């Protein structure tokens, strides 16, 4: 005669603290759109599961997968590109939409998959004494490829007269920043947008989403699975000294 477990007995690893996004959220100055930090992230899990009770963002849209399926799909590469956009350009900015932004500075693969998270930064960007750190390239000699950056600051030569690195006739200055007008209305308030780019390929699947943990029973034979290794037995309490490692 064999006694089987009621439903199951499964235990998961410890807290396993998430990625150190606190430093990025609390960063005094976020990375500029033209120059965005690129640091590999691993040995952690996405923090979207804890955002149930928090500061809701303006929009959270995942075209590739539904918001509830994020925990059901493993992640390999986590790279977030944060930038600032104008409110009136939110409607004009979208995948598959032709426009000036899409043509020159916003270029991405047609099959790119990811999530878009937008939120109003007026609560923090306000009264910042109109810092001009943010900058962008309004015009360029060609279309920037994905994940590409331009380092050429030479004055663009439109006419036959050489610019010689200084302003002149038919000479254009490509680099430009978003003018901060204190009289800007609600619709002109800047909005911070983050796009998560990742292919989920070329790297091992190590990061997994949170999984619900059932209850534990003792003094009764039950199945268990620790670190992949499966077994069956009874879990009890022992006071025998054991090595910390």
């Amino acid at each position, epitope marked *: 005669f064999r006694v089987q477990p009621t439903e199951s007995i499964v235990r998961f690893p410890n807290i396993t603290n998430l990625c150190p996004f606190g430093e990025v959220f609390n960063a005094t100055r976020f990375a*500029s759109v*033209y*120059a965005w*930090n690129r640091k590999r992230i691993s040995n952690c899990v996405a923090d979207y599961s804890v955002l149930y009770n928090s500061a809701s963002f303006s929009t959270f849209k995942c075209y590739g997968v539904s918001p509830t399926k994020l925990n059901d799909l493993c992640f390999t590469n986590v790279y977030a590109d944060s930038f600032v956009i104008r409110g009136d350009e939110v409607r004009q900015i979208a995948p598959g939409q032709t426009g000036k932004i899409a043509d020159y500075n916003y270029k991405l693969p047609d099959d790119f998959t990811g999530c878009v998270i937008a939120w109003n930064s007026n609560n923090l960007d306000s009264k910042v004494g109109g810092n001009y*750190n943010y900058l962008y390239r309004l015009f360029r000699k060609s279309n920037l490829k994905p994940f590409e950056r331009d*380092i050429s*600051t030479e004055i663009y030569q439109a006419g036959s007269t050489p610019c010689n690195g*200084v*302003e002149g006739f038919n000479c254009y200055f490509p680099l430009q920043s978003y003018g901060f007008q204190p009289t800007n209305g609600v619709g002109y308030q800047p909005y911070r947008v983050v796009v998560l780019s990742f292919e989920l390929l070329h790297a091992p699947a190590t990061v997994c989403g949170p999984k619900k943990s059932t209850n534990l029973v003792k003094n009764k034979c039950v199945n268990f699975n620790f670190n992949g290794l499966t077994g069956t037995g009874v879990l009890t309490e022992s006071n025998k000294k054991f090595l910390p490692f």
Partner: nanobody, 119 residues
């Protein structure tokens, strides 16, 4: 205008290792891209290195590692190594300035600093 000059120089011993620290004192700084160029007789200006506003830095293979510049918290740290007699050249620094059209709408081109190696 920003003056990056720190000191005239000093004696250097064979196989030395000096890590100069920029003063980083003056007016309010800005997130402007920086470019480092090398000049010498018989050669024109070349794009030796380019460091962005903390995003990433690109350096030539010849100057990779042994000569480098790092940007951190609005501070420039130069790393100097592999000192040889042939390194005698002139360093040029190029920056980007937008709010400079009030009286001189021209780029702030710092004076080239000459460096020579001789025992």
């Amino acid at each position: 205008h920003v003056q990056l000059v720190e000191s005239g120089g000093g004696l250097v011993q064979a196989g030395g290792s000096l890590r100069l620290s920029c003063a980083a004192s003056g007016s309010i700084f800005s997130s402007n891209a920086m470019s480092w160029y090398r000049q010498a007789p018989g050669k024109q200006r070349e794009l030796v290195a380019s460091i962005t506003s903390g995003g990433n830095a690109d350096y030539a293979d010849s100057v990779k590692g042994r000569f480098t510049i790092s940007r951190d918290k609005n501070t420039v740290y130069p790393e100097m190594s592999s000192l040889k007699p042939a390194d005698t050249a002139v360093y040029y620094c190029h920056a980007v300035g937008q709010e400079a059209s009030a009286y001189a709408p021209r780029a702030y081109w710092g004076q080239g600093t000459q460096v020579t190696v001789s025992s």
